[PDB]
Amino acid sequence: APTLPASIFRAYDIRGVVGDTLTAETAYWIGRAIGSESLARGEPCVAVGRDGRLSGPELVKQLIQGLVDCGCQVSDVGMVPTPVLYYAANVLEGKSGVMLTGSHNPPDYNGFKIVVAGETLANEQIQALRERIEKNDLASGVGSVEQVDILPRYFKQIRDDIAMAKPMKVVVDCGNGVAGVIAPQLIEALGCSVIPLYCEVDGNFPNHHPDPGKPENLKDLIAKVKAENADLGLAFDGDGDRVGVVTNTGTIIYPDRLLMLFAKDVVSRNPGADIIFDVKCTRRLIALISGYGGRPVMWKTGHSLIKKKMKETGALLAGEMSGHVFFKERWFGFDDGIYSAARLLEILSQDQRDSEHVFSAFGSDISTPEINITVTEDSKFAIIEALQRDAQWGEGNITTLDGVRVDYPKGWGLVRASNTTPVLVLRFEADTEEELERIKTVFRNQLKAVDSSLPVPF
Numbered sequence: 496a497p498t499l500p501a502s503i504f505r506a507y508d509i510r511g512v513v514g515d516t517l518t519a520e521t522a523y524w525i526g527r528a529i530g531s532e533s534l535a536r537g538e539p540c541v542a543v544g545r546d547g548r549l550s551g552p553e554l555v556k557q558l559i560q561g562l563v564d565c566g567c568q569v570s571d572v573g574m575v576p577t578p579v580l581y582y583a584a585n586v587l588e589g590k591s592g593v594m595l596t597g598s599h600n601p602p603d604y605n606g607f608k609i610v611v612a613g614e615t616l617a618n619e620q621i622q623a624l625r626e627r628i629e630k631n632d633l634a635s636g637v638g639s640v641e642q643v644d645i646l647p648r649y650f651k652q653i654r655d656d657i658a659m660a661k662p663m664k665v666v667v668d669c670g671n672g673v674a675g676v677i678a679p680q681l682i683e684a685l686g687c688s689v690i691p692l693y694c695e696v697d698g699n700f701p702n703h704h705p706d707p708g709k710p711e712n713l714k715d716l717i718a719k720v721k722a723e724n725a726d727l728g729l730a731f732d733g734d735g736d737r738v739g740v741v742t743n744t745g746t747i748i749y750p751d752r753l754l755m756l757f758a759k760d761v762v763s764r765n766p767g768a769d770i771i772f773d774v775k776c777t778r779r780l781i782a783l784i785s786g787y788g789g790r791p792v793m794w795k796t797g798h799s800l801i802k803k804k805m806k807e808t809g810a811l812l813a814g815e816m817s818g819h820v821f822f823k824e825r826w827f828g829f830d831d832g833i834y835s836a837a838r839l840l841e842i843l844s845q846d847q848r849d850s851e852h853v854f855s856a857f858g859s860d861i862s863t864p865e866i867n868i869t870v871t872e873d874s875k876f877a878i879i880e881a882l883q884r885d886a887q888w889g890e891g892n893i894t895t896l897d898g899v900r901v902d903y904p905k906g907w908g909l910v911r912a913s914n915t916t917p918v919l920v921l922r923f924e925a926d927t928e929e930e931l932e933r934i935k936t937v938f939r940n941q942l943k944a945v946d947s948s949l950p951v952p953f
C-alpha cells in the first residue's frame with residue numbers, strides 16, 4: 496500500500512480531485528480497506544454503484560478490484576443515484592455498499608460514501624480505513640463480481656407504495672447529474688406531467704452545477720415553473736440524496752419547512768413517533784412535532800450522523816437543513832431525494848390548495864440563510880470550544896451537541912464548525928426583525944470576544 500493523502504479522508508465520506516488527490520491507485524486501496532472492514536464485520540457481499548461523473552467508469556473498476564482482492568462478493572449496480580445504492584445494500588444479499596460519487600461538486604471531484612454491515616461510516620470509522628492502508632491491515636482473497644440490474648426494482652418499489660390522488664404538473668431539474676436516470680420517469684409514472692430541465696446525464700455539468708441549496712441553481716426551474724403554469728418545481732443534487740422544492744408561484748421551500756409537512760403526515764399516522772432534525776432547523780419543528788404527539792429529537796449535522804441517530808432512536812423520519820430527508824416509515828431510513836419527492840407529491844396531490852398555500856399555511860418567522868465565516872483549519876474547532884467553554888449568552892436554553900445553539904423566548908441562533916471546510920456556519924431565526932438583530936448582536940459580541948479579528952458579516 497502507498498501513502499495516500501490524509502485530506503481525502505473526511506467526516507462523513509471520502510472526497511478528492513481526480514488525477515490529483517484521487518487516482519486509480521487511491522480507489523483500489525480504498526476498496527481494499529472497505530473490503531477488509533466489511534469482512535471483519537462478517538459481510539463478504541458488497542454492492543457497488545457510481546454516479547454520472549466523467550471519472551466514474553474508470554475509477555469504479557479500481558474500487559471493484561480492491562474489494563475483489565479481499566475475497567469480497569461484489570454486486571455491480573452500474574450507474575445509479577446514491578439512494579439506489581443504499582437501497583441495493585438493503586434488499587440484496589449483503590448489507591455493505593460503496594457509492595463512488597462526488598455529490599454536487601465541480602466535474603473533477605469524485606469520492607466514496609460507504610455502508611458496512613448496515614452502518615454508514617463516519618468520523619473514526621473513516622479514519623479506521625485510512626489507518627488500515629497505512630498499516631497494511633488488509634485482507635486477501637479471490638473474490639467475484641456479478642452485475643445486478645437494480646433500478647427497475649427500486650422504481651417498482653416506490654411506484655407500488657405511492658398513491659397520488661390527482662394528477663400534477665411538475666418541472667424536474669436534475670442539473671445533468673445522475674438523478675436524470677429515474678426521477679422524470681418515476682414522477683410521470685406516479686401520475687404526473689413532467690417538464691424536464693437538464694435531465695440528460697452529463698458529467699461536464701454544462702448548465703448549472705447540480706446543487707439545489709444555492710438559489711441561483713434554482714433560477715431556471717423557477718422561471719420554467721411560472722412559464723409553464725406548473726404545480727411544483729423539483730430539483731436534485733448531483734447524486735440524488737438531496738431534493739429542492741419550488742412552489743407554483745416560484746417560492747423556494749427551505750428543507751426544514753419541507754420537514755414540517757413530512758413530520759405532520761408521518762406523526763399523524765404513528766402517534767408518539769420520533770422525528771429527528773439537525774441544529775440548523777427552525778424551532779417551529781419542535782412545536783409541530785410535539786403538537787401532533789410526536790417526539791422531536793434535535794441532532795448533529797451530517798448524513799452519516801443522522802442515519803446513526805435514527806437507528807438509536809427508532810425515528811420514523813429525519814431531515815437536515817441541507818436538504819437530505821430520511822424516511823424510515825414505509826421505507827429503509829436512508830436519505831433519498833427521489834423517494835422524498837414521491838412522498839411530497841403524494842401529500843400535495845391530496846390537498847385542494849396549490850403548493851404555495853399548502854406551505855404558506857405553516858406561517859413564518861424572520862430567518863437568515865446559512866452564513867459562513869472563513870476561519871482556519873487550525874482554529875475552527877478551537878473557536879467553538881472557546882465559545883462552549885466561556886461564552887456568555889444571557890438568558891436562553893443553550894445547546895452544545897454540535898457547536899453552540901441558543902434558543903431565546905423569541906428566537907434562536909447557531910454557530911458550528913463545518914466538518915468539510917475551514918469555516919464557521921451560522922443561522923438565526925426570530926419572531927421579529929428587532930429580535931433577529933438582538934440575537935445576531937449577541938453572537939457577534941461572543942465571537943469578537945474569542946478573536947476581535949474575526950470577520951463577522953452581520
Ligand SMILES: O=P(O)(O)O[C@H]1O[C@H](CO)[C@@H](O)[C@H](O)[C@H]1O
Nearest residue numbers: 507796797798815817913914915
Ligand atoms: O459541511 P457541513 O456543514 O459539516 O455539512 C454539510 O455537508 C453534508 C454533506 O453530506 C450534509 O450531510 C450536511 O447536512 C451539510 O450541512
Ligand SMILES: [Zn+2]
Nearest residue numbers: 598732734736
Ligand atoms: Zn448529494
